[PDB]
């Protein structure tokens with residue numbers, strides 16, 4: 311009966327969970343709304359953070375430090391880099407980096423600042439739980455590296471560069487920051503993304519067309535994981 | 540009295556305060572150390588966050604949500620954009636933006652995400668307090684706009700662009716994120732920076748030469764502000 315945080319970046323990523331849960335209580339905090347529900351005897355706290363690294367860092371910190379979350383599941387969409395990924399495919403992050411954290415003028419690798427590492431890992435036990443849920447429900451699930459930064463990527467050259475440097479399978483704007491917070495606060499973290507676009511030419515149009523559906527796929531999956539916790 | 544958080548990004552920005560305080564208690568939390576001291580009968584919490592937006596967001600969130608800080612003073616160094624600023628000069632931020640928060644592909648202004656604003660303001664009463672301290676101690680103090688992002692700027696073209704878009708007087712990697720956290724959590728925030736470099740060609744060398752001294756200037760000033768709180 312651990313307290314579980316479920317976090318997305320946008321309303322579209324969390325609204326499907328709220329509609330499935332049906333009954334919940336709202337609390338205004340940190341210029342946002344935090345939702346509280348009981349799901350199959352688990353206390354849940356849910357929110358969308360708003361877009362980007364700072365917003366998602368704040369929400370993760372609030373869910374743990376203020377509301378006492380003991381596990382955090384992130385659900386949302388992402389831009390696909392690995393050519394085997396199609397729109398709608400699920401990817402969980404084994405590790406994540408910030409591609410736009412840059413003090414390389416002083417000789418450091420891209421994504422590195424003193425005191426930290428380039429990559430942050432997610433929780434092994436949660437990742438193994440996800441694999442058993444995927445097997446149980448006959449859902450295709452890929453493991454990979456996610457590159458996080460505060461830009462919407464819609465450029466083939468930029469995509470290729472980030473993929474080359476970090477061996478990244480997808481990009482988004484919240485994962486590495488959320489995973490960093492959870493690691494710092496000793497909370498098991500799981501980062502799941504469904505592909506909404508391929509992060510190249512006209513990715514903005516694919517995102518618009520597929521965000522609602524891809525968000526539902528990821529949302530469903532994390533709610534099934536809550537059952538096995 | 541109110542509980543005061545004093546936050547920097549690097550050891551160089553906070554160590555001068557610790558040496559002045561002499562006596563304090565260290566607590567390991569959020570993969571970092573938080574320092575607790577009494578200064579002229581004011582309860583302080585101090586830390587350096589480590590570099591960048593995510594790290595500084597986390598520390599500000601911890602200081603407020605976990606440790607109950609009621610006011611937050613940020614102290615450190617910055618890269619000067621306004622040509623009237625010289626190395627060592629003090630600038631407090633009236634407002635701040637994230638120059639590298641970019642969903643402009645969907646038509647939004649640079650620095651904007653839905654639910655937030657382009658600029659975040661600092662606390663008027665703290666800024667006026669700083670002006671009285673500057674007058675009292677005969678210290679030159681300038682007000683300006685600070686642009687925040689996760690890159691060390693050492694490029695005249697980048698400097699010119701950020702200055703043009705945001706009317707920014709200086710740049711750094713933590714201010715807008717810290718100010719955003721404080722605003723979200725209803726905590727008065729003050730952001731003070733002493734110039735370490737001019738953010739152009741060979742800014743890395745100027746930073747190295749002047750960081751220790753510039754950091755001490757900012758650190759001294761925020762400690763004097765604590766006396767008037």
Ligand SMILES: CCC[C@H]1CN(Cc2c[nH]c3c(N)ncnc23)C[C@@H]1O
Nearest residue numbers: 319361387388389462463482483509
């Ligand atoms: C408004 C769009 C930005 C949302 C969607 N989300 C994930 C994402 C999907 N496709 C992406 C791409 N091509 N680049 C970056 N990130 C993403 C990150 C922000 O919360």
Ligand SMILES: CCC[C@H]1CN(Cc2c[nH]c3c(N)ncnc23)C[C@@H]1O
Nearest residue numbers: 548590616617618691692711712738
């Ligand atoms: C590795 C050094 C970067 C430190 C110093 N700090 C302020 C700063 C001074 N000069 C700057 C410039 N030209 N660009 C960005 N930021 C800065 C931001 C990071 O915490």
